[PDB]
């Protein structure tokens, strides 16, 4: 077993597969509640399922690390947890809807303060 995570605070965590699996399940359900025509949904399943499908083939934690890339398991679980909070907040945010506000004319125009031909 690796002695240290190389980072302060980030401690070595056992049963990573169980934790990663459990995290992937919850986020999948969290996106399950989403509407079926949300781009955020469309991609999270394929990404998460790709991860949650890679979780199994590599019993060795180091083997899984290489297979999944993207960093070490210790951070990787945190990545998953972050996204759990994202989905719960995302459902609460309803960002799949259309534009709340149209920018006023000449808002995002650079350079500023130049007369124009109508």
């Amino acid at each position: 077993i690796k002695a240290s995570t190389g980072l302060t605070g980030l401690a070595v965590s056992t049963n990573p597969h169980h934790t990663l699996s459990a995290l992937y399940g919850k986020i999948l359900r969290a996106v399950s509640k989403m509407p079926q025509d949300a781009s955020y949904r469309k991609y999270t399943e394929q990404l998460v399922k790709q991860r949650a499908d890679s979780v199994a083939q590599h019993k060795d934690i180091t083997a899984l690390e290489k297979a999944v890339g993207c960093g070490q398991v210790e951070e990787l679980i945190v990545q998953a947890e972050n996204e759990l909070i994202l989905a719960r907040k995302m459902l609460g945010w309803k960002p799949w809807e259309k534009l709340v506000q149209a920018a006023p004319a000449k808002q995002w125009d650079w350079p500023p303060a130049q007369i124009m031909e109508p």
Partner: protein
Amino acid sequence: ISGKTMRGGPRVPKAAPYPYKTKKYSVFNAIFDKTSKRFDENSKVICVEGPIAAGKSKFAKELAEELDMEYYPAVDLDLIYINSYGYDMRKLDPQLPPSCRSYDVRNFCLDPSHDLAAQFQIRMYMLRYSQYIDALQHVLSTGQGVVLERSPYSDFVFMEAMFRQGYLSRGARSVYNELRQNTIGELLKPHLVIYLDLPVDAVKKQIKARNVDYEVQSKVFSDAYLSDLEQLYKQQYLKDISTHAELLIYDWTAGGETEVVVEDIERIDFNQFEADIHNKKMLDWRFPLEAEWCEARIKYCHEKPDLMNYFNVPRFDVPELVRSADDGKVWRDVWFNAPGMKYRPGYNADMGDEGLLTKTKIGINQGI
């Protein structure tokens, strides 16, 4: 505080639990056995609140189920009327009508106009308060976490609520209000408090789904009464707990997803709170030394009688709280002559106990 699901299995007690149910705790015993040795992560109290008919009993059951604490069922007013052989002293009819005949939550809901209702109004606080000490007993002995559905700390909400309705007396409001201080000072506030928040209409929807012939058809259920819970919870009850215990408020149980509640609680850690001791939050749990742990432990495993005896408060200035002497005398005659009350529990050989003529044992805080 941490869920079994993230443990990938069950939690273990760090050391052999102490048989506090069946054994007495001595200061000699404190010297002979250390206290915080058993203590672990989950050694904390998660109190629940919500407007009435919030169905939180199933919530707390599952929450303690999948975080590995004790459920500690809710108020059981009947236990006054229950004995070693079960039967209800409510069975005893109005032989002594005026202030000896019973009054359960049914009677309250049927009619809160009866001055005798004030009886349980305070005895109900005692039941909560006695339960709370039971929870502290279980914590300090086993080190295992606990979850009480409701607390004596919160009981005054209903108290001021009923009084605002007018049901209690101006006298009784003073009695209970001052008397809380006497005992309520002697309890540790919970680590974490979870309050559930439906509107008055919404709870009326669910209480009509409870279909209780002594509640749903009753008349107490005015918006004002069931709303006074809301205001009192919102500001009066919450704030002091908001000072000591960490406060989480989701919308309610029904939409309250257990797993996210599990995760939100687990995310809220307290090692973060292991900073300056003088901080007022978590204050009632900063035990410097193993000796001070044992002081708290012995104080609950060996002074529950002392805890009960705080209630001995003399107030003969309230008529509904006074009892008629001769009637009360008969009320004594009924109870201790009625089946299964002549002796201490286990010595009511008239009702069946055997092994007497040699048995001389008595249980820790065994009632009497």
